[PDB]
Each structure stands twice: as C-alpha cells, then as structure tokens.
C-alpha cells in the first residue's frame, strides 16, 4: 500500500496472507469469507504469461496476522488448502476480466479477536454503496512504493497497512488507460487535483476492498485488488474485481460442495 498507514490491531480480521512454502514468500493478499473459504484474485494463482500456475500443495494461507514477517505465535493460524477454484472465464489473455478465485481450506479456522469473516454484498448493498465518490478501504502487506520499477523511500512494511480511497466514475476510469475495461471491474483512487494520494501496489493483489454499511454497520467486501498501471501514479487508478457481479459463481461453487 502506497501512502497508507499502519493498521490497528484487529482492524481487518478477514485479511489473509497467501504464502508460498518454498521459497518462503508472500504471494498476495486474500480474504476470509467464512470458516472454510478464502477469496482472492485468480492472477495470484494462475498467470501463464509469467508461467505462474500454483496448485493447492504449493500454498499456505495465513490468518490473523499483523506483522508481515513474524510468525505470530499465539495469534495467527496457518492453514492448508484443499481445493482451488478459478472462475472458468477468467481472462488472463487480455484484460484480467473475472479476476476471481475461491480457495477451500482443508479444515475450518476458528474465529477469535483477530480472525473474523467479512460479508459479501447483496444487490441493495451493492446498489447503494457502489457510487462514485464514496470511499472504500484497502489493506495489505505489499510494497510501499513502486515496484514494477522496484523502489526505495522504504520498500516493504513491517505491519499491515491501510488506505481509504474514493470510487471513481466509469468514464474517468476508461479514459485513464488503454486496457479494455469491463463491467466486472471498477476503479478507485484520488484524482490529480484532489490533493490526497494512495494506492495499492505489488504484493497487495488479491486482497479486500471493503466498505462499511451505514444501514447496518457491517463491513462488506466490494472489490478484490486486481490490477493497475504502476502504483499511485498520477492520473492512473487502481482496478478491482466487482465482487457482486460475480456472486452467483461464488454461491454456485460454495453450494456445489457444499458438504
């Protein structure tokens, strides 16, 4: 996260780390949506241009974390995966359309003060909250400064970082980029004029864009960190997978097994 700040403890108890187990590295963020299901970006697992193709046994999920690099001994829980599900029409050839994946955990996690699921939106929560100008929140342990162009100024955080960003109008989104934008995406970030900065960055992909509902006080996951050109570059925006537009596939797959 670029231009964010340190999360409070227990501020985002649905944040998950995707961690590979040799070499030990952070791949991506993710989120906990029930005791057995994790939501992430499909490009975290599967990206042929770069010969990336992870399966279950390649990965650990880590839940309950605050520190990026510490094993948080009586706080985090590490889990193994039993099944990965990628959207069957994820478009890695062109524009990362339908950038979504579900992971089934081998056995359920227990909730705690540090581990707690986020809600998925319904139609009326989506309708009402997904409006240009409304702010959402992004979290993660990714770079603090541009890294598809690897940077200094500090590099990597020690602790989970947070930033709140406005949703942007679809025309300004589409006019910022040469990539074809779909309805399954939205963009977010401040405009060059507005004074404020901030963005996701590498290592943050896969994690939650969340908003809090003013009607019932719950946190809802509205996007997944998907792509963007650079990090925090002026006149560029972050793009997120639209979680509500893909909720039927989510339900479909967690109903089919579904056990």
């Amino acid at each position: 996260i670029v231009e964010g700040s340190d999360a409070e403890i227990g501020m985002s108890p649905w944040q998950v780390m995707l961690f590979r187990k040799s070499p030990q590295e952070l791949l991506c963020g993710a989120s906990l949506i029930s005791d057995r299901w994790v939501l992430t970006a499909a490009h975290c697992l599967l990206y042929p241009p770069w010969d990336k193709n992870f399966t279950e046994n390649d990965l650990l999920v880590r839940i309950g974390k605050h520190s990026r690099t510490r094993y948080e001994r009586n706080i985090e829980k590490i889990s193994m995966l039993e099944k990965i599900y990628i959207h069957p029409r994820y478009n890695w050839r062109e524009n990362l359309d339908r950038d979504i994946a579900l992971m089934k955990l081998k056995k359920p996690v227990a909730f705690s003060d540090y581990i707690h699921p986020v809600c998925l939106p319904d139609r009326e929560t989506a309708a009402s909250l997904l409006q240009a100008g409304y702010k959402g929140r992004v979290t993660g342990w990714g770079n603090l400064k541009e890294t598809w162009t690897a940077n200094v100024g500090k590099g990597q955080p020690s602790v989970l970082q947070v930033v709140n960003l406005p949703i942007v109008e679809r025309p300004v989104c589409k006019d910022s980029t040469r990539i074809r934008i779909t309805d399954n995406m939205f963009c977010a970030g401040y405009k060059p004029d507005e004074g404020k900065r901030g963005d996701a960055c590498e290592g943050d992909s896969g994690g939650p864009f969340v908003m809090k509902s003013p009607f019932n006080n719950r946190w809802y996951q509205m996007g997944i960190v998907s792509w963007g050109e650079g990090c925090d570059r002026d006149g560029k925006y972050g793009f997120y997978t639209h979680v509500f537009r893909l909720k039927k596939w989510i339900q479909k797959v967690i109903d089919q097994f579904g056990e």
Partner: peptide
Amino acid sequence: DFEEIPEEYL
C-alpha cells in the same frame, strides 16, 4: 525474509 514457521505446516 520471513521468520521460520513450524514444520508441521509444510
């Protein structure tokens, strides 16, 4: 860069 995790997780 990461601290070592317990070997029952591998």
